[PDB]
RNA sequence: CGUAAAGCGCACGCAGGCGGUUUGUUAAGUCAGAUGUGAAAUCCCCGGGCUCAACCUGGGAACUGCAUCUGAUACUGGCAAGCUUGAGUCUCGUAGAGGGGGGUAGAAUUCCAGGUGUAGCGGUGAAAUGCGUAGAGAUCUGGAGGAAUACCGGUGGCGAAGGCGGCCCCCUGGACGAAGACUGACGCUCAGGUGCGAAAGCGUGGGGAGCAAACAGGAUUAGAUACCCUGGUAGUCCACGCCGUAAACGAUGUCGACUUGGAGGUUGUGCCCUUGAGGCGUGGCUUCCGGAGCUAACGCGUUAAGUCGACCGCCUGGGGAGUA
């Protein structure tokens, strides 16, 4: 569930500072971390429809954040996508 | 979800009368206070307080001629889903001219009557019969 | 102005919000009435009575609960007024055009009883009129002398007697009710908050009304 | 658009529609004035002329519009900079038949193998078919399996909806709460589209106790292609795919704001005494009764069908026909 420790590493790696936990930049990484994490649990089991709806939400969540962040400051947008491997 | 707080103001007043509350508070905004002055200067409300620093709490003291509500009718027209604008000399009279049509003009908000004597039209906000 | 001890406010948890202006929370989940705003009430409404009483108006005192009905009985029969302590006969006022006929029957029998026919047929049916006299007795006893329409309805309880209040309200007549936490004041004109069903409560009440009505013919 | 025709079964979500609040800014939409033009006729207004009128006819108004120019800057739009009451993230916890996968426990039914023991057993309104002296049923011991989880159990809980129930483990979704920290409008809805979606049914391979369409026999019956009884296949159970429909129903779209009360249930949490199964408050979900009001009425009623705002679906007499 993105163990407390995992977040404590992510926040320090993306936000303006360590106390930051709300910034758009950080939030995206958290979702992606979770998304990548469920891949295994979903490439396997291939049936947990209830769980997948949970996943599907965070996919939507993520996109909306980026679209917001793209129109705001393409700079931070280009870096994050590059530092986080996405935009198929 | 909270698209037009202007309609919200009216409703909180309409519902306020039904419960016969003394005053109905609401999250004030520049535009709303403008309307409040029109009403008070007209006589549909008494003495709005604009208390607020970053949380504008505009509480509207209500008028009661008797154990009957003063505001006999309040309906909004230019809604967010549909704005309405009328030429100067094409404004419509409210209750055969004994109500008011709060209209926003190039000179700000005023009563429909004020608009005619001032000779300018604008966005009609709402009717208060 | 607390004349006597207990009149402060009572009757329930399942109150009536219509009288939210007159409340205080008590240590039983029961309500306590703000008699403070009531002191002006009974003071003021009494003046209304005094004025109308001098107008040679009529004051009708209704009581129920079987407990305080006797107390009310003394109230009307103390100055000159009329009272109704038993079951308020539905519609005596709005339908007085016919209840008038019932009154006449009593008067005749009232004569037929103390001095009139009592043995003409047989004691068994002579008894019939007597027990019938009792029926009209508890109903139109203290009202027989009115013969018209009253002009003021002083009512003890608004719960049991909402029936008459609405009827009186339906006519061009003012009413005075000692409403309680679970009473609807909206059917009353000159409301009187406080207790209604307390036995001693009416004793304080009526006598206060009794004096005001006694002098009010000035 | 609760019951008359009318809420997609539920959901995510691009275009599209709409969008909190502060200030400045620009002047697009909007407004004022002027101008160019908006053919004449016709209509309208006031006149005039044919004996009046119809009719002809003078001047005006109008031509509801469009383009340009100059001012106005409230409201909406574009831009820039913020704010935090919307939304979202984190920390510590809580309840739960939330979902998928792997094991597992006991009762019972059926069948098989024996022991004991003897004329019924079973079934029904009665009865018959049927099982039985090759020895049943009943009862005892052992074994084989398949499916479902008594009691707890609660208009109790969880889930978008369909749904979901013994116990243990693994992987995992969501909801809600205390206290603050943080991001800074990042929203609401949503045609097309994608996904999920009871039972039945379909395909490939397993499994097959009980139950049971079809089917058979026996009754009932005027008939009985049924209702009842004795048996019984597909199916129902597992795996992977398809189907996409339900009176998929609070017959009530989603989201947000405002508007008297009462009794309950359930899950958090601060405080007074835990001084004694408690008292005082504040939140989430849910049950019932009813005020105003609403409504055709029944009824709904702070979980609204009340008062309003945003967006989407849908209805337009019945039958024909949700059919060709």
mmCIF file of C-alpha atoms (C1' of nucleotides) in Angstrom, chain D:
data_model
loop_
_atom_site.group_PDB
_atom_site.id
_atom_site.type_symbol
_atom_site.label_atom_id
_atom_site.label_comp_id
_atom_site.label_asym_id
_atom_site.label_seq_id
_atom_site.Cartn_x
_atom_site.Cartn_y
_atom_site.Cartn_z
ATOM 1 C "C1'" C D 1 -40.001 12.127 -16.274
ATOM 2 C "C1'" G D 2 -41.830 8.120 -7.561
ATOM 3 C "C1'" U D 3 -47.243 5.297 -9.349
ATOM 4 C "C1'" A D 4 -50.544 8.533 -15.792
ATOM 5 C "C1'" A D 5 -45.872 8.412 -21.718
ATOM 6 C "C1'" A D 6 -40.876 9.503 -19.737
ATOM 7 C "C1'" G D 7 -34.169 8.444 -15.434
ATOM 8 C "C1'" C D 8 -29.357 4.922 -19.789
ATOM 9 C "C1'" G D 9 -28.391 -1.447 -15.220
ATOM 10 C "C1'" C D 10 -24.012 1.015 -12.891
ATOM 11 C "C1'" A D 11 -19.606 3.436 -13.666
ATOM 12 C "C1'" C D 12 -14.847 6.087 -15.830
ATOM 13 C "C1'" G D 13 -14.033 9.439 -19.062
ATOM 14 C "C1'" C D 14 -11.978 12.903 -24.399
ATOM 15 C "C1'" A D 15 -14.738 16.702 -27.187
ATOM 16 C "C1'" G D 16 -18.778 19.891 -25.465
ATOM 17 C "C1'" G D 17 -21.456 22.957 -21.519
ATOM 18 C "C1'" C D 18 -20.763 25.561 -17.040
ATOM 19 C "C1'" G D 19 -17.294 27.181 -13.004
ATOM 20 C "C1'" G D 20 -15.203 29.556 -6.151
ATOM 21 C "C1'" U D 21 -12.722 34.051 -4.478
ATOM 22 C "C1'" U D 22 -8.939 38.927 -4.435
ATOM 23 C "C1'" U D 23 -6.575 42.545 -7.348
ATOM 24 C "C1'" G D 24 -4.705 44.620 -11.733
ATOM 25 C "C1'" U D 25 -5.150 44.395 -16.764
ATOM 26 C "C1'" U D 26 -7.487 44.179 -22.017
ATOM 27 C "C1'" A D 27 -12.039 45.597 -24.022
ATOM 28 C "C1'" A D 28 -13.661 40.437 -27.350
ATOM 29 C "C1'" G D 29 -19.389 39.591 -25.803
ATOM 30 C "C1'" U D 30 -22.621 43.413 -23.304
ATOM 31 C "C1'" C D 31 -24.165 48.782 -22.939
ATOM 32 C "C1'" A D 32 -24.600 54.259 -24.641
ATOM 33 C "C1'" G D 33 -24.160 57.819 -28.690
ATOM 34 C "C1'" A D 34 -23.264 58.995 -33.713
ATOM 35 C "C1'" U D 35 -22.630 57.396 -38.638
ATOM 36 C "C1'" G D 36 -23.311 54.191 -43.398
ATOM 37 C "C1'" U D 37 -26.767 51.272 -44.871
ATOM 38 C "C1'" G D 38 -31.182 48.534 -44.175
ATOM 39 C "C1'" A D 39 -34.825 49.633 -52.583
ATOM 40 C "C1'" A D 40 -39.917 51.321 -53.619
ATOM 41 C "C1'" A D 41 -44.397 49.061 -52.417
ATOM 42 C "C1'" U D 42 -47.073 46.717 -47.964
ATOM 43 C "C1'" C D 43 -48.158 47.352 -42.603
ATOM 44 C "C1'" C D 44 -48.601 51.292 -38.611
ATOM 45 C "C1'" C D 45 -49.366 57.154 -37.415
ATOM 46 C "C1'" C D 46 -51.296 61.946 -38.860
ATOM 47 C "C1'" G D 47 -53.044 64.359 -43.155
ATOM 48 C "C1'" G D 48 -55.394 64.846 -48.292
ATOM 49 C "C1'" G D 49 -58.382 63.416 -52.849
ATOM 50 C "C1'" C D 50 -62.420 60.382 -55.562
ATOM 51 C "C1'" U D 51 -70.653 61.924 -53.219
ATOM 52 C "C1'" C D 52 -68.232 57.823 -48.269
ATOM 53 C "C1'" A D 53 -65.758 53.568 -48.538
ATOM 54 C "C1'" A D 54 -62.955 50.135 -50.960
ATOM 55 C "C1'" C D 55 -59.346 52.685 -53.471
ATOM 56 C "C1'" C D 56 -55.185 56.470 -54.787
ATOM 57 C "C1'" U D 57 -51.936 59.422 -52.231
ATOM 58 C "C1'" G D 58 -48.316 63.280 -48.970
ATOM 59 C "C1'" G D 59 -44.905 63.489 -44.485
ATOM 60 C "C1'" G D 60 -43.258 60.512 -40.364
ATOM 61 C "C1'" A D 61 -42.375 55.985 -37.737
ATOM 62 C "C1'" A D 62 -40.579 51.314 -38.648
ATOM 63 C "C1'" C D 63 -37.464 48.137 -41.447
ATOM 64 C "C1'" U D 64 -37.054 44.249 -35.085
ATOM 65 C "C1'" G D 65 -30.666 43.495 -38.765
ATOM 66 C "C1'" C D 66 -25.705 44.240 -40.198
ATOM 67 C "C1'" A D 67 -20.639 47.073 -40.642
ATOM 68 C "C1'" U D 68 -17.629 51.057 -38.879
ATOM 69 C "C1'" C D 69 -16.005 54.947 -35.174
ATOM 70 C "C1'" U D 70 -15.789 56.812 -30.362
ATOM 71 C "C1'" G D 71 -16.711 56.478 -25.013
ATOM 72 C "C1'" A D 72 -18.343 53.065 -20.525
ATOM 73 C "C1'" U D 73 -15.733 48.565 -17.591
ATOM 74 C "C1'" A D 74 -20.120 46.847 -13.484
ATOM 75 C "C1'" C D 75 -21.214 41.218 -15.410
ATOM 76 C "C1'" U D 76 -19.049 37.023 -18.773
ATOM 77 C "C1'" G D 77 -14.498 36.005 -21.723
ATOM 78 C "C1'" G D 78 -8.532 36.338 -22.641
ATOM 79 C "C1'" C D 79 -3.863 37.320 -19.573
ATOM 80 C "C1'" A D 80 -0.888 37.950 -15.180
ATOM 81 C "C1'" A D 81 -0.404 37.516 -9.748
ATOM 82 C "C1'" G D 82 -2.325 35.532 -5.543
ATOM 83 C "C1'" C D 83 -6.051 33.406 -1.332
ATOM 84 C "C1'" U D 84 -8.542 29.648 0.874
ATOM 85 C "C1'" U D 85 -13.636 28.316 3.050
ATOM 86 C "C1'" G D 86 -14.250 23.578 -3.169
ATOM 87 C "C1'" A D 87 -10.936 19.332 -4.682
ATOM 88 C "C1'" G D 88 -6.526 16.558 -3.625
ATOM 89 C "C1'" U D 89 -1.925 14.441 -0.727
ATOM 90 C "C1'" C D 90 0.572 12.718 3.968
ATOM 91 C "C1'" U D 91 0.989 11.002 9.212
ATOM 92 C "C1'" C D 92 -1.720 7.909 13.349
ATOM 93 C "C1'" G D 93 -5.942 4.718 13.755
ATOM 94 C "C1'" U D 94 -11.022 2.155 13.050
ATOM 95 C "C1'" A D 95 -15.054 -1.128 11.315
ATOM 96 C "C1'" G D 96 -16.516 -4.258 7.624
ATOM 97 C "C1'" A D 97 -20.481 -11.326 4.050
ATOM 98 C "C1'" G D 98 -15.221 -5.362 -0.389
ATOM 99 C "C1'" G D 99 -12.331 -8.434 -4.500
ATOM 100 C "C1'" G D 100 -9.000 -12.600 -6.378
ATOM 101 C "C1'" G D 101 -5.854 -16.894 -4.946
ATOM 102 C "C1'" G D 102 -4.302 -21.195 -1.596
ATOM 103 C "C1'" G D 103 -5.533 -24.535 2.380
ATOM 104 C "C1'" U D 104 -9.180 -26.306 6.015
ATOM 105 C "C1'" A D 105 -13.351 -27.849 9.902
ATOM 106 C "C1'" G D 106 -18.015 -30.088 11.499
ATOM 107 C "C1'" A D 107 -23.146 -31.499 10.851
ATOM 108 C "C1'" A D 108 -26.096 -33.734 7.239
ATOM 109 C "C1'" U D 109 -27.643 -36.253 2.566
ATOM 110 C "C1'" U D 110 -26.414 -40.107 -1.133
ATOM 111 C "C1'" C D 111 -23.635 -44.437 -2.440
ATOM 112 C "C1'" C D 112 -20.415 -48.687 -1.218
ATOM 113 C "C1'" A D 113 -18.641 -52.630 2.323
ATOM 114 C "C1'" G D 114 -20.051 -55.604 6.677
ATOM 115 C "C1'" G D 115 -22.750 -56.631 11.918
ATOM 116 C "C1'" U D 116 -27.787 -56.857 14.349
ATOM 117 C "C1'" G D 117 -32.870 -57.885 12.948
ATOM 118 C "C1'" U D 118 -37.683 -58.604 10.588
ATOM 119 C "C1'" A D 119 -42.480 -57.640 7.484
ATOM 120 C "C1'" G D 120 -43.324 -53.973 5.915
ATOM 121 C "C1'" C D 121 -41.007 -48.993 3.815
ATOM 122 C "C1'" G D 122 -42.014 -44.847 1.503
ATOM 123 C "C1'" G D 123 -45.870 -41.364 -0.136
ATOM 124 C "C1'" U D 124 -50.639 -38.798 0.126
ATOM 125 C "C1'" G D 125 -56.613 -35.891 0.728
ATOM 126 C "C1'" A D 126 -56.869 -41.115 -0.210
ATOM 127 C "C1'" A D 127 -53.849 -43.909 -3.251
ATOM 128 C "C1'" A D 128 -50.794 -45.747 -6.741
ATOM 129 C "C1'" U D 129 -45.910 -46.078 -9.267
ATOM 130 C "C1'" G D 130 -41.774 -47.590 -6.694
ATOM 131 C "C1'" C D 131 -38.122 -50.227 -2.684
ATOM 132 C "C1'" G D 132 -38.495 -55.193 0.036
ATOM 133 C "C1'" U D 133 -38.345 -62.322 2.445
ATOM 134 C "C1'" A D 134 -32.199 -62.470 -3.244
ATOM 135 C "C1'" G D 135 -33.862 -59.924 2.683
ATOM 136 C "C1'" A D 136 -35.350 -53.570 2.800
ATOM 137 C "C1'" G D 137 -36.569 -49.602 6.322
ATOM 138 C "C1'" A D 138 -34.551 -48.873 11.205
ATOM 139 C "C1'" U D 139 -29.883 -49.069 14.040
ATOM 140 C "C1'" C D 140 -24.070 -49.606 14.706
ATOM 141 C "C1'" U D 141 -19.027 -49.327 12.815
ATOM 142 C "C1'" G D 142 -15.646 -48.053 8.444
ATOM 143 C "C1'" G D 143 -14.887 -45.708 3.852
ATOM 144 C "C1'" A D 144 -15.921 -42.863 -0.558
ATOM 145 C "C1'" G D 145 -16.913 -38.401 -2.385
ATOM 146 C "C1'" G D 146 -19.696 -33.610 -4.174
ATOM 147 C "C1'" A D 147 -21.996 -29.197 -2.686
ATOM 148 C "C1'" A D 148 -23.619 -25.772 0.829
ATOM 149 C "C1'" U D 149 -22.066 -23.146 5.441
ATOM 150 C "C1'" A D 150 -27.213 -24.244 11.155
ATOM 151 C "C1'" C D 151 -26.560 -21.156 15.689
ATOM 152 C "C1'" C D 152 -24.209 -16.191 15.806
ATOM 153 C "C1'" G D 153 -27.687 -12.989 12.188
ATOM 154 C "C1'" G D 154 -29.283 -7.831 13.440
ATOM 155 C "C1'" U D 155 -35.659 -2.362 7.708
ATOM 156 C "C1'" G D 156 -27.188 -5.002 11.094
ATOM 157 C "C1'" G D 157 -22.277 -4.096 7.703
ATOM 158 C "C1'" C D 158 -19.400 -3.517 2.917
ATOM 159 C "C1'" G D 159 -19.635 -2.492 -2.405
ATOM 160 C "C1'" A D 160 -20.611 2.117 -8.323
ATOM 161 C "C1'" A D 161 -24.111 -1.410 -9.532
ATOM 162 C "C1'" G D 162 -24.724 -6.545 -10.202
ATOM 163 C "C1'" G D 163 -23.782 -8.435 -5.546
ATOM 164 C "C1'" C D 164 -21.204 -10.431 -1.102
ATOM 165 C "C1'" G D 165 -21.852 -15.040 4.636
ATOM 166 C "C1'" G D 166 -18.120 -21.237 8.601
ATOM 167 C "C1'" C D 167 -12.465 -20.750 9.759
ATOM 168 C "C1'" C D 168 -7.174 -19.622 8.611
ATOM 169 C "C1'" C D 169 -3.217 -17.360 5.263
ATOM 170 C "C1'" C D 170 -1.455 -14.419 1.124
ATOM 171 C "C1'" C D 171 -2.113 -10.075 -2.677
ATOM 172 C "C1'" U D 172 -5.046 -6.013 -2.732
ATOM 173 C "C1'" G D 173 -9.487 -1.664 -3.340
ATOM 174 C "C1'" G D 174 -12.357 1.627 -1.004
ATOM 175 C "C1'" A D 175 -14.871 4.325 3.082
ATOM 176 C "C1'" C D 176 -14.686 7.198 7.482
ATOM 177 C "C1'" G D 177 -12.502 9.781 11.852
ATOM 178 C "C1'" A D 178 -8.838 13.087 15.428
ATOM 179 C "C1'" A D 179 -5.203 16.644 14.890
ATOM 180 C "C1'" G D 180 -2.576 19.632 12.301
ATOM 181 C "C1'" A D 181 1.023 20.078 7.998
ATOM 182 C "C1'" C D 182 1.140 20.800 2.675
ATOM 183 C "C1'" U D 183 -0.406 21.788 -2.925
ATOM 184 C "C1'" G D 184 -3.141 26.184 -4.609
ATOM 185 C "C1'" A D 185 -9.430 25.964 -8.274
ATOM 186 C "C1'" C D 186 -5.834 21.211 -10.149
ATOM 187 C "C1'" G D 187 -13.502 21.513 -10.592
ATOM 188 C "C1'" C D 188 -19.267 19.474 -11.849
ATOM 189 C "C1'" U D 189 -21.332 17.128 -15.723
ATOM 190 C "C1'" C D 190 -20.392 14.371 -20.136
ATOM 191 C "C1'" A D 191 -22.653 12.905 -26.837
ATOM 192 C "C1'" G D 192 -19.173 9.411 -29.072
ATOM 193 C "C1'" G D 193 -16.072 5.684 -26.500
ATOM 194 C "C1'" U D 194 -14.186 1.928 -22.847
ATOM 195 C "C1'" G D 195 -15.104 -1.206 -18.608
ATOM 196 C "C1'" C D 196 -18.097 -3.815 -15.178
ATOM 197 C "C1'" G D 197 -22.807 -6.261 -15.348
ATOM 198 C "C1'" A D 198 -28.065 -11.424 -11.728
ATOM 199 C "C1'" A D 199 -30.128 -15.900 -13.379
ATOM 200 C "C1'" A D 200 -30.782 -18.404 -17.593
ATOM 201 C "C1'" G D 201 -28.185 -19.758 -22.071
ATOM 202 C "C1'" C D 202 -23.281 -20.948 -25.255
ATOM 203 C "C1'" G D 203 -18.185 -23.179 -26.329
ATOM 204 C "C1'" U D 204 -13.648 -26.527 -24.662
ATOM 205 C "C1'" G D 205 -12.119 -29.691 -20.764
ATOM 206 C "C1'" G D 206 -13.306 -31.591 -15.761
ATOM 207 C "C1'" G D 207 -16.919 -32.832 -11.599
ATOM 208 C "C1'" G D 208 -21.442 -34.820 -10.571
ATOM 209 C "C1'" A D 209 -23.852 -35.569 -3.575
ATOM 210 C "C1'" G D 210 -28.246 -33.050 -3.229
ATOM 211 C "C1'" C D 211 -31.812 -30.447 -6.383
ATOM 212 C "C1'" A D 212 -33.848 -30.547 -10.855
ATOM 213 C "C1'" A D 213 -36.084 -28.212 -16.626
ATOM 214 C "C1'" A D 214 -36.952 -32.310 -20.684
ATOM 215 C "C1'" C D 215 -38.740 -37.098 -20.230
ATOM 216 C "C1'" A D 216 -41.384 -41.566 -18.101
ATOM 217 C "C1'" G D 217 -44.674 -44.005 -14.996
ATOM 218 C "C1'" G D 218 -48.757 -43.436 -11.188
ATOM 219 C "C1'" A D 219 -52.799 -40.638 -9.663
ATOM 220 C "C1'" U D 220 -56.408 -36.357 -9.999
ATOM 221 C "C1'" U D 221 -59.622 -35.054 -13.629
ATOM 222 C "C1'" A D 222 -65.102 -34.576 -18.380
ATOM 223 C "C1'" G D 223 -60.119 -33.952 -20.465
ATOM 224 C "C1'" A D 224 -54.813 -32.835 -17.234
ATOM 225 C "C1'" U D 225 -49.718 -32.280 -22.819
ATOM 226 C "C1'" A D 226 -50.422 -29.175 -15.257
ATOM 227 C "C1'" C D 227 -51.158 -28.384 -9.972
ATOM 228 C "C1'" C D 228 -49.711 -33.921 -6.317
ATOM 229 C "C1'" C D 229 -46.367 -38.580 -5.909
ATOM 230 C "C1'" U D 230 -41.968 -42.015 -7.552
ATOM 231 C "C1'" G D 231 -37.656 -41.578 -10.429
ATOM 232 C "C1'" G D 232 -34.768 -38.533 -13.597
ATOM 233 C "C1'" U D 233 -31.089 -35.636 -18.201
ATOM 234 C "C1'" A D 234 -29.213 -30.902 -19.442
ATOM 235 C "C1'" G D 235 -28.185 -27.563 -15.813
ATOM 236 C "C1'" U D 236 -26.777 -25.980 -11.048
ATOM 237 C "C1'" C D 237 -20.118 -26.641 -8.984
ATOM 238 C "C1'" C D 238 -14.543 -25.510 -10.950
ATOM 239 C "C1'" A D 239 -11.171 -23.464 -15.050
ATOM 240 C "C1'" C D 240 -10.732 -20.218 -19.293
ATOM 241 C "C1'" G D 241 -13.784 -17.357 -23.164
ATOM 242 C "C1'" C D 242 -18.770 -15.397 -25.019
ATOM 243 C "C1'" C D 243 -23.500 -13.554 -24.129
ATOM 244 C "C1'" G D 244 -25.113 -8.094 -22.178
ATOM 245 C "C1'" U D 245 -30.415 -8.939 -20.743
ATOM 246 C "C1'" A D 246 -33.949 -8.480 -15.131
ATOM 247 C "C1'" A D 247 -40.154 -5.428 -11.819
ATOM 248 C "C1'" A D 248 -30.907 -4.833 -13.240
ATOM 249 C "C1'" C D 249 -36.640 -1.150 -8.433
ATOM 250 C "C1'" G D 250 -35.752 3.879 -2.945
ATOM 251 C "C1'" A D 251 -40.123 1.823 -10.381
ATOM 252 C "C1'" U D 252 -36.844 8.330 -7.858
ATOM 253 C "C1'" G D 253 -29.688 10.540 -13.028
ATOM 254 C "C1'" U D 254 -25.060 12.947 -11.000
ATOM 255 C "C1'" C D 255 -23.091 16.958 -8.065
ATOM 256 C "C1'" G D 256 -23.674 21.261 -4.843
ATOM 257 C "C1'" A D 257 -26.264 25.004 -1.466
ATOM 258 C "C1'" C D 258 -30.308 26.456 1.827
ATOM 259 C "C1'" U D 259 -35.026 25.173 4.934
ATOM 260 C "C1'" U D 260 -38.753 23.309 12.225
ATOM 261 C "C1'" G D 261 -38.522 18.257 14.910
ATOM 262 C "C1'" G D 262 -38.821 13.110 17.603
ATOM 263 C "C1'" A D 263 -37.608 8.158 18.593
ATOM 264 C "C1'" G D 264 -33.857 4.245 16.904
ATOM 265 C "C1'" G D 265 -29.559 1.327 15.099
ATOM 266 C "C1'" U D 266 -24.386 1.318 13.922
ATOM 267 C "C1'" U D 267 -18.937 3.015 13.624
ATOM 268 C "C1'" G D 268 -15.036 7.118 15.133
ATOM 269 C "C1'" U D 269 -13.588 10.624 18.437
ATOM 270 C "C1'" G D 270 -12.819 15.409 22.502
ATOM 271 C "C1'" C D 271 -14.593 16.389 27.560
ATOM 272 C "C1'" C D 272 -17.087 15.953 32.865
ATOM 273 C "C1'" C D 273 -16.669 11.334 37.459
ATOM 274 C "C1'" U D 274 -14.449 5.305 35.152
ATOM 275 C "C1'" U D 275 -16.387 8.377 40.683
ATOM 276 C "C1'" G D 276 -21.206 2.853 39.608
ATOM 277 C "C1'" A D 277 -24.065 -1.133 33.151
ATOM 278 C "C1'" G D 278 -22.753 6.480 32.869
ATOM 279 C "C1'" G D 279 -23.670 12.277 31.739
ATOM 280 C "C1'" C D 280 -22.058 16.555 28.241
ATOM 281 C "C1'" G D 281 -20.770 17.501 22.582
ATOM 282 C "C1'" U D 282 -19.083 16.983 17.718
ATOM 283 C "C1'" G D 283 -18.650 13.767 12.793
ATOM 284 C "C1'" G D 284 -19.952 9.047 8.732
ATOM 285 C "C1'" C D 285 -23.670 5.614 7.087
ATOM 286 C "C1'" U D 286 -28.511 3.790 7.780
ATOM 287 C "C1'" U D 287 -34.419 2.753 9.838
ATOM 288 C "C1'" C D 288 -39.097 4.611 11.057
ATOM 289 C "C1'" C D 289 -42.814 8.783 12.317
ATOM 290 C "C1'" G D 290 -44.267 13.137 10.916
ATOM 291 C "C1'" G D 291 -44.066 20.115 10.343
ATOM 292 C "C1'" A D 292 -43.932 23.794 6.712
ATOM 293 C "C1'" G D 293 -44.176 23.107 1.794
ATOM 294 C "C1'" C D 294 -45.044 20.237 -2.346
ATOM 295 C "C1'" U D 295 -48.454 16.922 -5.030
ATOM 296 C "C1'" A D 296 -53.847 14.580 -9.159
ATOM 297 C "C1'" A D 297 -54.218 11.995 -4.832
ATOM 298 C "C1'" C D 298 -51.585 8.274 -2.389
ATOM 299 C "C1'" G D 299 -47.719 10.140 -0.068
ATOM 300 C "C1'" C D 300 -42.328 12.568 0.217
ATOM 301 C "C1'" G D 301 -40.752 15.062 4.023
ATOM 302 C "C1'" U D 302 -32.630 17.675 6.137
ATOM 303 C "C1'" U D 303 -31.015 10.409 3.093
ATOM 304 C "C1'" A D 304 -37.114 15.231 -0.066
ATOM 305 C "C1'" A D 305 -41.231 14.232 -4.761
ATOM 306 C "C1'" G D 306 -39.454 21.534 -0.469
ATOM 307 C "C1'" U D 307 -36.723 26.217 -2.366
ATOM 308 C "C1'" C D 308 -32.771 26.960 -6.350
ATOM 309 C "C1'" G D 309 -28.234 26.295 -9.630
ATOM 310 C "C1'" A D 310 -24.917 22.897 -13.565
ATOM 311 C "C1'" C D 311 -24.971 19.151 -17.043
ATOM 312 C "C1'" C D 312 -26.730 14.665 -19.358
ATOM 313 C "C1'" G D 313 -30.623 10.890 -20.851
ATOM 314 C "C1'" C D 314 -35.717 10.475 -22.206
ATOM 315 C "C1'" C D 315 -41.520 11.244 -23.191
ATOM 316 C "C1'" U D 316 -45.485 13.604 -26.897
ATOM 317 C "C1'" G D 317 -52.997 9.105 -27.138
ATOM 318 C "C1'" G D 318 -53.883 3.449 -27.125
ATOM 319 C "C1'" G D 319 -53.101 -0.647 -30.381
ATOM 320 C "C1'" G D 320 -49.701 -1.759 -34.701
ATOM 321 C "C1'" A D 321 -44.587 -2.547 -31.851
ATOM 322 C "C1'" G D 322 -40.214 -2.375 -28.988
ATOM 323 C "C1'" U D 323 -42.144 -5.258 -34.052
ATOM 324 C "C1'" A D 324 -40.733 -5.213 -39.620
#
